[PDB]
Every structure is written in C-alpha cells, then in structure tokens.
RNA sequence: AGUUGCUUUGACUACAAAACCAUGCCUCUCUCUUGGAGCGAAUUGGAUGAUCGGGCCGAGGGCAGCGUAGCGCCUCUUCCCCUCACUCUCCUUUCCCUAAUAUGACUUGAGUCAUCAAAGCCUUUCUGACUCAAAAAUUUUUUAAAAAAAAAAGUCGCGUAUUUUAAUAUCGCGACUCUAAUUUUUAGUCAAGAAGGUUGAAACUUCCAGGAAAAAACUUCGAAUUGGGAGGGCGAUCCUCCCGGUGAACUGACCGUACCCCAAACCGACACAGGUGAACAAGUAGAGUAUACUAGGGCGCUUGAGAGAACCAUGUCGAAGGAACUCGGCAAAAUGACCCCGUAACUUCGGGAGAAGGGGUGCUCUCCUAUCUUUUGAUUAGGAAAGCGGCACAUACCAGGGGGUA
RNA sequence: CGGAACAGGUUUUAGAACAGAACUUCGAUAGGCGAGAGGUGGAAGCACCGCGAGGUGUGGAGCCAUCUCGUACUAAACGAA
C-alpha cells in the first residue's frame, strides 16, 4: 500500500530475509540460548531487515524478558547505520537499564544529545528508577521535569504511584492523585488500578467502591479486565464474596481477546473462592480458546483442584498432560508431589519422583522441599537431612541460594533435642553454614540442650564469636556454664 | 612485471506503553504463524406428532392347467417417499457484523544521517548442553565367578471374564513412535560470553639482469638472581627432584612539540611570476589524478579615480583570392574523440598502420538482449525500428594535419 | 561689446591632456519616461493535438545595442550668488 511501502512479503529476497526477523529469531523456540543462537546467525549473515522490522522484533523480545538479544539487536542495528529517534532512544534507554543495570542507564543518559533529553526519554529513565525501587532518584527527577517545563503524563505518575505502593508508602497515593488532577493530566486504567490497589492496602476496602463509581462516572477511561481483576483480587484478599462474583463474571465479559493471563486470573480467583463448579467452567472455555494447552495453564489448574480437594480430577487432568507434553515441566510434578505426601501417599509421589527424569524434567528444590517437609512433618531426621542436602545442592531455578525455612529448621531442631542427636544437629548447622551466614536468633541460641547427652566441645563460649556474635538468651547460660 | 586482493557498507516507517494485582517453584518450562462462544440470516438439517397422496414387498380365500409346485386376473393395509406443524442438538453451502492480517495516519522533487576493519587464526578463561568412557546399581545365559542387556510412556489390532458400578480399567499378546534416566569421574565436542595477541597491511604466476647487514628484535635451548614445596642426611645448611624465575590497583627518565612550510617566515641582495621529498584531498561531466564547473577550506594577489588617441603587447572575427609572403608556410589556420567500414608501395615478415580514404554520433517512444541488477513484474548498458528539433548532436571544454620523394 | 570676455556644470559632429563646438532652467545639453523606426524572429501564460520528444493557436508575438520625435521627472543658474 501507499501508507506502508515497505512490504514485508512481497519484498525482495536476495536484499531482505525470507521471513520477518521477529519469527526467524524464534525459530527453535523460546528459550534465551536459542535467541541467542539465532541471533548470532542472523547477524553474520548477508540479509537484511527493516528498521520497523527490528522494532517489532525489540519490543517482542521485550515482552517476553530477552532483554540481551533485544539490546543486542538495537545496538548492532544502530552500528550498521539505522538512526535512532527520540523514542528509538527511550526505548533503548530502558533496554540499556534492563540488560546491563540503572548505572549503565544512567550514563546512556548522559551522553545522549541535549536534544534528544526530551519527556520520552526522562519518562523512560524514570520508570527505570522506579521498577528499581529507589525513591530519592524518582522524586530528584520528577522535581528536574517540573523545574525544566518538561511535561509528566499520567505514565509517570503511575510509576511514581507504583514505586509508592511497592515500598511501603501507600499513604502518598491519593494525594498523588488530586495532584495529577491538579494539572489537567487526565487518569488511564492503570491509574485507577493501581489507586484502588494503594486504597486497600491502607486497610479501607469501601475506598474501592468510590474509584469505581468515579471511574464509571468519568466516561472517559473504558474499563477492561484488568481492572475487575484488580478490583476481584481485592474483593478475594478482603473477604467479600459476592462482590469477587461480579467482579469476577465482568471480567469473563470483558475478556473478549481470550487472553491467556485473564484466564489464570479467572481459574486462580475461583480457586480461592472455593466454587469448583465456576473452576471447571473457566478451564473449559480455556481449553476450548487454547486447543494445544501450554504448561502454565496445567499448572494452576491442578494446583486449584488439589486446592479444592478433588483429587481424582486433578489425577485425571495430570495424566492427561502426561500424554500431551511438548516439554516435561517439574512444577506440573511437583504440584500432585505435593498432593500425595500432604496426604500421606508416598509411594505415588516417590513413583512420580523416580519416573520424572527419565520423561524429560530433572528435580528442582522444590520437590525434595516437599519430601523434607513430608519427612519433618513424620518426625524422621535422617531421611530429611538427605532431601535438605539435595535441595541446597541443586540451588534455586534462577541461580540464587536454596535455604529451608525457619519454622522448618525451628521444628528439626526441635526434633534433635528429644532424640540428643548432636551429629544430626552438627550437620544442620553445617549446611547452614553452607547455605548462608547470618543464621542467629533461635537456630542455635536455645538449642545448647542438644549438649546435654555426653560431654560438650572445646571452645566454651568461643564458638559464638565466630559468627559474626550471638546473643543468647538469659536461661541459657546456666546449663552453658555448667558444663563450662 | 602481470594478475588476484586491499577499494567501504547500510538506514531513512512516522512508534515513551518498557508503569500490575491472583498463583508462583525461572508463572507462559520457552506462546512466531489457531476465527467468533455473534442471540445474526437464507438453502439444509432433525432429538418430535399426526393427516392426505403415491409406490414395492407381503397376506389370505380364489377365477386358476396336473399326483406336491405354477402363469394373467380379483380384495387389502403395513413399510418407504412426500405434506403441515414442533424444533436447535449434530452436518453441508453462502451472506452480514465483529477480530486479526506490523505502529501511526511534495522536499531520496534525486538528498540526509550513520559507518569506515570486516572476515579469519592462535593462547587462555567463566558458565550451559550433549557424548561417551569407566566403575558401582538389576535380569538372562554359561561355568559363588565371567559374557549380553532392558527399565518409563502414548497409539493400532486379536482372543478371552472379574463391580457395592469412574470397566476410558484390569489378562496375555503382535506392531509403530517418543525420552534418557541413581551416584562418581575423565576426556572431548558444540553453544553463549569475557580478556589478550596475530593476519588482513598481501597471495599467485612468469622472467632474467638473480635481487643488504646485524647474539638487534623474535622463536628455541642452556645456565640462572633475593622465592616457595617434597624425599636423603652419625651435618655442612649438603644432596636430588617439583613449581616459579621480569610477573603489577609498581614504574616508564631525558630531548622535540609555538608558528611558516609551493611560501610575504625556506634557497634566490626584495613581502622576487624562479627553485623546494613524500602522505591526504567530497561532487557532476569524463577512460582518466586530463579538462570545465563546483560546495568545504582558503583567498581577492599592499596603489587607485578617469579617459577609451598614436604606438606596443595579448586575444576574437573577417569579403574575394589561397603561400602570390618569406632565407624558409616562421607564425597562424587546420586535423583532433569513440564506434563501424576500408587500408598501398616496401619489408629485416616484427612492421609500415591510427597508413591513406570514408560513414555514424542529440533527444523521444517501442521492442530484443543482458546487469554475475542486495527492493527484478522496473532500473542501467548495447542493438534494431519508428519518430522529433535545430545552421550545427565528439555542440562548451578536451582532442593526430596527411601524402610522395632525397 | 564694456558686470564684456572667461571660469564652472551637462555634453559632443570635436578630442591624449589641452583646444574646438552645442546647451546651461523664459532650458531638450545629458539621463529617465512615452511613441515610432530599426534588429531579432514568434516571449510568458493559457488552450488544443500527441504516450512522448514535441507541434499548433492566441499573435509580425515578446525583447532592446542604437536613431528620431514628444515630454522638465532627474542633473545642467537649485545663482534668495
Ligand atoms: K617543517
Ligand atoms: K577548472
Ligand atoms: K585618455
Ligand atoms: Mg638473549
Ligand atoms: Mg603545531
Ligand atoms: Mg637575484
Ligand atoms: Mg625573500
Ligand atoms: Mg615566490
Ligand atoms: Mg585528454
Ligand atoms: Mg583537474
Ligand atoms: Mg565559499
Ligand atoms: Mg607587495
Ligand atoms: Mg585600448
Ligand atoms: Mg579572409
Ligand atoms: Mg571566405
Ligand atoms: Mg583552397
Ligand atoms: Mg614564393
Ligand atoms: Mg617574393
Ligand atoms: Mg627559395
Ligand atoms: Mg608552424
Ligand atoms: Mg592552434
Ligand atoms: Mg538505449
Ligand atoms: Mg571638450
Ligand atoms: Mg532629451
Ligand atoms: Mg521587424
Ligand atoms: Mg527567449
């Protein structure tokens, strides 16, 4: 056409790519190595792409968290002579702060042109600092843009309102809001959200009713259904049932996309409601939207049954993603792990255990964090110090440290004093040695009573020192000095 | 010396949505590409009930030709096909509406902005995935010992009976497809990155005239400083092996650096039209670094105002004639480019030769070919063919006079 | 002839400077403006024909080195010098 030249299909194949760009990079899926792999391959090759093309192709790898290829893509795009705008410029500004930190943010800001420091990109820097929680360089921004004449949509203000909400100052919303209408900036649907989000979190649910009469009184915001989702988790979160009914059915009337996320939202609120019938009613609309159902969605909906207690159909719809699975997701496991040792059968979970890797998923921490809580919960120590040992070594899913929790430990602990088992406490503190560093309050402050079978070690009150000092308590020492 | 490389390559599409609550174990575990559940219609469907009409088969008595069984004729309604209603639970064809199909909704009018080491090779080095390899796990076979090996699911089909009814299961089989698992470790490969160096910066071919030196630098080897370990030692800090041995959040002294440098600053007595290495040097026309014009950068040349005689210099043009000029065609004029045709005497067979002599050349349209067209259903180059304008189409600039004979 | 002749200014049929000749405001000396002659040869704009290069009409069109005529608008006595 006249309004858009640049053709993606009837384009010629020995300058341009046979495919667009945005399918080619997810050829073999979704996964960052293998984005990464065909972003590699596309790069060194002779085929070219439009500049359109490459922010279509940004902004759906922003979407779903690739963050790398995307600012990859931009700044080898960028090299190779495709300008940048004002707002190819916020866009890799936010890129730049995704990928490599806000400081890398920061001086991408820095050294852009004065120019091209215009509401786009102090808009873009300023969501950056509030998705990074730091309040003091949110609000010295925001006061540069008043003092600047540079202009703050209500996008900004909702970052602010975001970045309040999250750390803890919910208070500072509603002034927030009589502020943005203080100067003509008119409120989106994230506004009115995330305002009735702050007004329950101060503990004032009937603040909920006025934002929605205001927000249908307005008339011109068109709710959608995030906003009944919003206003039904609340309703959920603060009891009130038959307002998160008909929060809940105009949010199915409103979802007229058959969104994915809309659908967890509608099977995980019925969940909490407790209506199974209204459950199972949302899967199958799921299921008919959705003809090649993906692993998320399995995975809430057997977590809601085994939640509502219907096993049987939770046991029917596992075996039937065991038969359709393109990748064999542990969570979808460790959900019916989870349902059979919570209800004491453990040779289907231990069957589930054995038989998973062998189908495509290795154990994470999450199942042998089942099977310690199953083994705490018994009163076995032995086989709990196995699945503890295993659960610390695999780690967590995204590189971080796996620890147990405190209650857990408290009640292990708890269990080593009737039995006077000092190597199996010996060997708790030693993986809490391993796991972190701190480890001091009740872990081992009371727990000197293990002591008390035969004998006691060397240091005598020199051991405590080392760990960065530990109070104990005042009816602790007695029997600490005895034994010198 | 000649080739092949070094020789740049792209974007122009207007776009802050990147701000989120449920569950959470890295919650899209990997979603690139799926038409609608419209209270929407028309031919069709049907989960339904009767009436009328038509048509087999069939039923008995018979008129009928036998000792059983007949061929035409005569009374009947089931069963099926239709029709009027009830009708949305299944199928077929189409239309409307809504969704999606990449954002939003004149100045490349011959430009602007980027880029200007890409691609390789060699050392390391962090992290993933796969592969063994190998051992420890269990079965079969062979003689407690040795050899070979599967483990988990989905789909199709066959023969056979167990419930207080989740029998879509349990019993044995034949076939197909998919996955690699409990622990330990090696060696490897790929994948994704991070530090160094190094090549590209030259390679090949041919030729004769046969194309620097240097314990400088570099690679190697030896010995090794003020170091750290492991075994001998009736010893004296001795002997033999191993690692390290120029390493860095050490330090890198001294001298030049202004300014001119085709020039008014250097060599010429001058602020002198002379002389003064190499490197870089956008665009259009062009074979070209020729030549014309040109932005950028630089400069207007350190005497001017008038007048527009002779004469002198340097240029443009010139009737008719065309070397009669003159020592002599001196000077000038002329020729001049590319493509095609054509090319003599003579010759040492290499030449002569661009011999000489001729023709065409602009623009427009349309075909044909190709350009080894990185926007291939329209652009450049070449050729045919038909037209258009002028005195003139190598239109300016640039750019052989030719022949005969001593 | 006797406040004559010069000089100055605008010029030119004259001219190296000088000299000559014309005119010098009750003035056409030069410039300008207007008209005509003369040269060139058919402007622009618009319309029509053609795919196009281009062609046709409006229309001896448009333009102007010179020459003549008209005309004090400017400079020559604007010399209340
Ligand atoms: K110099
Ligand atoms: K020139
Ligand atoms: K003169
Ligand atoms: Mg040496
Ligand atoms: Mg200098
Ligand atoms: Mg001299
Ligand atoms: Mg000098
Ligand atoms: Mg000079
Ligand atoms: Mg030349
Ligand atoms: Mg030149
Ligand atoms: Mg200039
Ligand atoms: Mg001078
Ligand atoms: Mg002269
Ligand atoms: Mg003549
Ligand atoms: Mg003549
Ligand atoms: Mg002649
Ligand atoms: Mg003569
Ligand atoms: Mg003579
Ligand atoms: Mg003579
Ligand atoms: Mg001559
Ligand atoms: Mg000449
Ligand atoms: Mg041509
Ligand atoms: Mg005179
Ligand atoms: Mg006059
Ligand atoms: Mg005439
Ligand atoms: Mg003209």
Same mark, same amino acid.
Request: charged share 30%; hydrophobic share 35%; net charge positive.
């Given at each position: 056409?006249?309004?858009?030249?640049?053709?993606?299909? *009837?384009?010629?194949?020995?300058?341009?790519?046979?495919?667009? =760009?945005?399918?080619?990079?997810?050829?073999?899926?979704?996964?960052?190595?293998?984005?990464?792999?065909?972003?590699?391959?596309?790069?060194?090759?002779?085929?070219?792409?439009?500049?359109?093309?490459?922010?279509?192709?940004?902004?759906?790898?922003?979407?779903?968290?690739?963050?790398?290829?995307?600012?990859?893509?931009?700044?080898?795009?960028?090299?190779?002579?495709?300008?940048?705008?004002?707002?190819? +410029?916020?866009?890799?500004?936010?890129?730049?702060?995704?990928?490599?930190?806000?400081?890398?943010? @920061?001086?991408?800001?820095?050294?852009?042109?004065?120019?091209? *420091?215009?509401?786009?990109?102090?808009?873009?820097?300023?969501?950056?600092?509030?998705?990074?929680?730091?309040?003091?360089?949110?609000?010295?921004?925001?006061?540069?843009?008043?003092?600047?004449?540079?202009?703050?949509?209500?996008?900004?203000?909702?970052?602010?309102?975001?970045?309040?909400?999250?750390?803890?100052?919910?208070?500072?919303?509603?002034?927030?809001? +009589?502020?943005?209408?203080?100067?003509?900036?008119?409120?989106?649907?994230?506004?009115?959200?995330?305002?009735?989000?702050?007004?329950?979190?101060?503990?004032?649910?009937?603040?909920?009713?006025?934002?929605?009469?205001?927000?249908?009184?307005?008339?011109?915001?068109?709710?959608?259904?995030?906003?009944?989702?919003?206003?039904?988790?609340?309703?959920?979160?603060?009891? =009130?049932?038959?307002?998160?009914?008909?929060?809940?059915?105009?949010?199915?009337?409103?979802?007229?996309?058959?969104?994915?996320?809309?659908?967890?939202?509608?099977?995980?609120?019925?969940?909490?409601?407790?209506?199974?019938?209204?459950?199972?009613?949302?899967?199958?609309?799921?299921?008919?939207?959705?003809?090649?159902?993906?692993?998320?969605?399995?995975?809430?909906?057997?977590?809601?049954?085994?939640?509502? *207690?219907?096993?049987?159909?939770?046991?029917?719809?596992?075996?039937?993603? +065991?038969?359709?699975?393109?990748?064999?997701? $542990?969570?979808?496991?460790?959900?019916?792990?989870?349902?059979?040792?919570?209800?004491?059968?453990?040779?289907?979970?231990?069957?589930?255990?054995?038989?998973?890797?062998?189908?495509?998923?290795?154990?994470?921490?999450?199942?042998?964090?089942?099977?310690?809580?199953?083994?705490?919960?018994?009163?076995?120590?032995?086989?709990?110090?196995?699945?503890?040992?295993?659960?610390?070594?695999?780690?967590?899913?995204?590189?971080?440290?796996?620890?147990?929790?405190?209650?857990?430990?408290?009640?292990?602990?708890?269990?080593?004093?009737?039995?006077?088992?000092?190597?199996?406490?010996?060997?708790?503190?030693? $993986?809490?040695?391993?796991?972190?560093?701190?480890?001091?309050?009740?872990?081992?402050?009371?727990?000197?009573?293990?002591?008390?079978?035969?004998?006691?070690?060397?240091?005598?009150?020199?051991?405590?020192?080392?760990? @960065?000092?530990?109070?104990?308590?005042?009816?602790?020492?007695?029997?600490?000095?005895? =034994?010198?």
């Amino acid at each position: 056409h006249l309004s858009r030249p640049r053709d993606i299909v *009837k384009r010629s194949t020995k300058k341009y790519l046979d495919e667009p =760009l945005y399918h080619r990079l997810f050829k073999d899926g979704g996964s960052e190595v293998s984005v990464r792999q065909q972003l590699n391959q596309f790069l060194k090759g002779t085929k070219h792409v439009f500049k359109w093309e490459v922010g279509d192709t940004i902004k759906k790898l922003r979407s779903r968290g690739l963050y790398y290829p995307a600012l990859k893509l931009s700044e080898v795009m960028e090299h190779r002579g495709m300008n940048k705008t004002v707002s190819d +410029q916020a866009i890799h500004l936010d890129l730049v702060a995704k990928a490599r930190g806000i400081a890398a943010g @920061e001086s991408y800001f820095v050294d852009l042109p004065e120019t091209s *420091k215009t509401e786009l990109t102090y808009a873009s820097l300023l969501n950056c600092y509030c998705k990074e929680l730091m309040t003091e360089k949110a609000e010295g921004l925001l006061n540069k843009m008043k003092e600047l004449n540079i202009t703050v949509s209500s996008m900004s203000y909702n970052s602010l309102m975001t970045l309040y909400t999250k750390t803890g100052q919910a208070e500072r919303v509603p002034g927030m809001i +009589q502020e943005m209408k203080a100067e003509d900036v008119m409120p989106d649907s994230y506004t009115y959200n995330v305002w009735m989000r702050a007004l329950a979190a101060t503990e004032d649910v009937s603040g909920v009713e006025r934002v929605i009469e205001e927000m249908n009184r307005d008339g011109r915001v068109a709710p959608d259904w995030t906003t009944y989702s919003n206003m039904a988790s609340i309703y959920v979160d603060a009891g =009130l049932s038959e307002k998160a009914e008909k929060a809940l059915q105009e949010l199915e009337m409103k979802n007229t996309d058959r969104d994915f996320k809309a659908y967890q939202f509608l099977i995980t609120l019925y969940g909490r409601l407790g209506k199974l019938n209204e459950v199972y009613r949302i899967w199958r609309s799921l299921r008919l939207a959705m003809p090649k159902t993906s692993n998320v969605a399995y995975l809430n909906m057997i977590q809601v049954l085994v939640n509502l *207690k219907d096993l049987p159909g939770a046991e029917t719809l596992f075996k039937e993603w +065991q038969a359709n699975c393109s990748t064999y997701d $542990i969570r979808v496991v460790n959900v019916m792990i989870g349902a059979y040792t919570r209800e004491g059968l453990v040779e289907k979970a231990n069957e589930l255990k054995e038989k998973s890797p062998r189908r495509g998923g290795k154990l994470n921490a999450k199942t042998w964090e089942l099977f310690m809580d199953y083994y705490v919960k018994r009163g076995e120590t032995a086989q709990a110090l196995e699945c503890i040992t295993k659960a610390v070594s695999i780690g967590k899913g995204d590189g971080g440290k796996w620890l147990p929790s405190e209650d857990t430990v408290r009640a292990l602990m708890s269990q080593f004093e009737e039995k006077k088992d000092v190597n199996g406490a010996e060997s708790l503190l030693e $993986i809490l040695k391993k796991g972190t560093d701190d480890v001091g309050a009740e872990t081992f402050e009371s727990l000197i009573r293990t002591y008390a079978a035969a004998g006691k070690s060397h240091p005598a009150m020199r051991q405590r020192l080392k760990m @960065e000092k530990v109070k104990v308590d005042k009816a602790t020492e007695k029997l600490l000095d005895e =034994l010198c």
